[PDB]
Design a protein around this ligand. Structure first.
Ligand SMILES: Cc1nn(-c2ccc(C(N)=O)c(N[C@H]3CC[C@H](O)CC3)c2)c2cccc(-c3cnc4ccccc4c3)c12
Length: 207
């Protein structure tokens, strides 16, 4: 496991999100599903030039998996996935400029729900989660785990869990007062409102 520090302003935004009183927290799910959809778009588009891109798995889907025992909600997709370089460097570059623009907009009166426009919708996870674990497999790299509790640092390690073939799992370790997002009716309500026209099948697992 390697440990990395966030730059000051990303750290500020993550703190803002994880701490703030904002009642409309359900928008986290729309943002993560949008990320999954974007990932699925990218691998599908690549496969149009090179069909072998799908040797690591043909199915293009999104699963939502609640676990009441672990107090986790996991968003699983079979999109393009992320390399080590994505997890440490490339997404850090995107996050830096996106954070800068979002924070400016917030100063000017924009709402937290607008976060996804700035390309940092991922951070909305911290509205409902104390810790976020990202397990990912990209065609060009090994399986990795990225993890952060939004306290100024994140970690990256090779992941020894079940091989995924290709794609991403975003595991939300939910805050104690945010367990409604484990409930079937609640998740279904949110998906219908915010994510009903996503171009990939979304399966809501139950327990
Ligand atoms: C920022 C971020 N987002 N995120 C995410 C999630 C799901 C998917 C998914 N479901 O695939 C996804 N996919 C995209 C990958 C890149 C492709 O170009 C387009 C699809 C993107 C992360 C996942 C893990 C980590 C980070 C992160 C955030 N802050 C940092 C700040 C500094 C340094 C590194 C940082 C890394 C991110």
């Amino acid at each position: 496991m390697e440990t990395f520090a966030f730059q000051a302003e990303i750290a500020q935004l993550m703190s803002l999100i994880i701490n703030t009183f904002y009642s409309n927290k359900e928008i986290f799910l729309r943002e993560l599903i949008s990320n999954s959809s974007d990932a699925l778009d990218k691998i599908r588009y690549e496969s149009l030039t090179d069909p072998s891109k799908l040797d690591s798995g043909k199915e293009l889907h999104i699963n939502l998996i609640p676990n009441k025992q672990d107090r986790t909600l996991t968003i699983v997709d079979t999109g393009i996935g992320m390399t080590k370089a994505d997890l440490i460097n490339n997404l850090g570059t995107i996050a830096k400029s996106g954070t800068k623009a979002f924070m400016e907009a917030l100063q000017a009166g924009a709402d937290i729900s607008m976060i996804g426009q700035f390309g940092v919708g991922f951070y909305s996870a911290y509205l409902v989660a104390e810790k976020v674990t990202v397990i990912t497999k990209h065609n060009d790299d090994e399986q990795y785990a990225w993890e952060s509790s939004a306290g100024g640092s994140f970690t990256v390690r090779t992941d020894t869990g079940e091989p995924m073939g290709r794609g991403t799992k975003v595991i939300l370790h939910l805050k104690e007062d945010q367990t409604e997002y484990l409930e079937e009716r609640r998740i279904k309500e949110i998906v219908k409102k915010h994510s009903q026209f996503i171009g990939y099948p979304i399966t809501l697992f139950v327990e």
